[PDB]
Design a binder for this molecule. Structure first.
Ligand code: FMN
Ligand code: FMN
Lengths: 199, 199
């Protein structure tokens, strides 16, 4: 359905859907296609330091349980339930995309192109963001709800250990997706003439 | 022409075109539309710290002359001509998009959401990257060649001063665009099974 929708609509219709349920139509195969297309997003010096680990169903829920538990040890009793309430809408989804950045790659590129050594650490985040956003738009184009979460770095250690992630991969973000199950919130924009100037 | 092309093609067909010429069909108005659509890209906490300053024709060339001159003072005589050779393909274009990030916004958001104070500086780069990439894809969808350059921070001061840019705006990148005038270079990809793991 990412062929149906044209570019402009894909940009404008992608919204953050924080509550998603399950659906058997959303398969590992379909996800596979989305990620293969998304990998066409560019990277500085084509270093392609981005890494994606997709957790589906069984493993998907396990992750969000990890988050819930990590929060249980860092939040006062009175705020716990309120803090983990939002985790429900993710845990209910089909799966979650874990976005990592290969730090060994960034470090090596800093050696090969010392003239940009200070920029590579940022281009690392830029490249991963472009990739994250592409995946997001593609999923929405296919009628799959998704949102971008950030439970790093508090869940990093645990996640890394339970899924044998190289030490050089740093967790950048998590994208829980699934059959949409909430109406996107209203979004406001600063007036255009304030963010854009022509000369 | 960004309605013609569908999403998947927009992702796959966007390439870096480093040599662009002029064309009167590429107007400030058309550019305007592209940027208004691109601003639908998301920002952390919807802080929208991104800022874009478009330099067209007269002012476009002036910028690239600034780059050329800045390089003339930082590069040994023997390497000058080789270093500024690539600047020709940009200077020949229609215009250039200057991507800034409002630092006062990032700093304020660090105050409002101290729980993510360490992430905002990176989300700043992420948000701007998502925006940069969207603009890039939209331009290509409309048959306009473009590339992403990084002459910051060496030209920052000069640019800031000759175009009255608030001090809190940091230069993140430059996108010279125009009538395509070069065939995109071959691009290679690391094997998919190495960047994507399923569980
Ligand atoms: C964060 C980031 C920084 C980049 N910086 C530069 C740059 O300074 N100069 C340049 O010519 N290209 C730069 N690029 C562009 C990449 O080299 C380019 O996107 C990639 O090789 C492009 O492949 P493309 O033609 O295949 O799609 C940058 C790309 C990213 C994602
Ligand atoms: C760099 C970056 C970090 C973000 N982090 C979070 C997060 O931790 N939690 C969350 O619910 N949304 C997060 N978001 C999502 C933004 O709040 C969201 O994209 C924006 O408000 C979405 O508008 P959308 O529904 O209109 O298109 C992040 C977005 C960006 C660009």
């Amino acid at each position: 359905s990412a062929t149906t929708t044209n570019l402009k609509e894909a940009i404008v219709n992608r919204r953050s859907i924080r509550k998603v349920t399950k659906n058997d139509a959303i398969t590992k195969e379909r996800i596979e296609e989305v990620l293969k297309t998304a990998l066409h997003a560019p990277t500085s010096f084509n270093m392609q330091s981005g890494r994606m680990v997709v957790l589906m169903d069984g493993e998907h829920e396990k992750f969000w349980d990890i988050v819930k538990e990590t929060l249980r040890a860092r939040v006062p009793a009175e705020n716990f339930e309120a803090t983990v309430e939002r985790l429900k809408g993710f845990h209910a989804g089909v799966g979650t995309v874990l976005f990592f950045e290969d730090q060994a790659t960034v470090e090596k590129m800093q050696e090969n192109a010392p003239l940009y050594k200070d920029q590579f650490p940022f281009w690392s985040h830029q490249g991963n963001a472009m990739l994250q956003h592409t995946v997001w738009m593609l999923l929405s184009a296919e009628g799959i709800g998704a949102s971008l979460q950030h439970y790093n770095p508090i869940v990093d250690a645990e996640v890394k250990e339970t899924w044998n992630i190289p030490a050089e991969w740093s967790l950048v973000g998590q994208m829980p997706f699934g059959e949409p199950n909430e109406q996107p919130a209203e979004r406001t924009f600063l007036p255009t003439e304030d963010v854009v100037k022509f000369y």
